[PDB]
Amino acid sequence: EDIKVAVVGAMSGPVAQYGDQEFTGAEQAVADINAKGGIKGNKLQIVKYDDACDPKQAVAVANKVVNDGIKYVIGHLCSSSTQPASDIYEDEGILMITPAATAPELTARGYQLILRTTGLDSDQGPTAAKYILEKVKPQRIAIVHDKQQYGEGLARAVQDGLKKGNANVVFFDGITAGEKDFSTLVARLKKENIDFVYYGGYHPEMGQILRQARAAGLKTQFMGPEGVANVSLSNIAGESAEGLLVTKPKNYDQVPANKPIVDAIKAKKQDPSGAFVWTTYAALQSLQAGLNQSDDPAEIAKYLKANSVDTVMGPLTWDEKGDLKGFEFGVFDWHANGTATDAK
């Protein structure tokens, strides 16, 4: 009979866009897998859970998944939501594969049932720093973040890499997620003649910062991580998004072999351009490879760590703590278009 797989992410709230990408990828992977026969004739079925990328709700969802008897979780997306949920999953023998959480701490605590189909900010942060030091070469930098594990973690990593390269960081400070009035920020950037800003956070905040900065006549060059590289950023900022530098996973939707998946998704009037469509599809493929060997969570995790799995992201390989080996974030130019081109 049917095999239940929880797909957990932000299906509502300020960053619902992340959940949209996730579900789109999950839905297509499950349809593709079941069309080919499922797991030895057994069909896979997705059970959608909304954690709104809110830590307290992610904890409620984790407990509900356990109580619903589901043993495999594709998900949770935000780092600060994924980590407390992983504590429950590890304690309850539930396999958890996140297609989007990037904070290093998630996998630095000895957990055996946690894996990822995305990279680490201990790689994403230095990639940004290096690019700024080698290609951008700005004169007066400011680093802003939203005080959350993800954003503040990247902000600190970039600050450390810039300090190490003798860059002039004029200020480092956080703002509150949810904030829409960035007038004092814009004024400080203007007053202190800041030509470059790295923002560690998500698209709702980045979008407003960009609009207001441009409305105030600022020519400052901004840069942000993959949490900012999506169509919702472009919809919020409009023309203020052109010029934005971002670090993000490769454009898997442009890999020729993936075209059928792209066409199938477009065919449903869904967006196949978001990175989490692909990291999530890949997570389902990883779960598929393991379910073909065993239905036990620890055996699946052990199997995946000992064997590569071919996916829409290419062949994935994991280390003993559950991280992808050799994953790389690229640096791109984002456009009001909602598209990304490799930065020079």
Ligand SMILES: CC[C@H](C)[C@H](N)C(=O)O
């Ligand atoms: C959707 C994931 C977000 C963008 C970020 N990578 C995090 O770990 O919170």
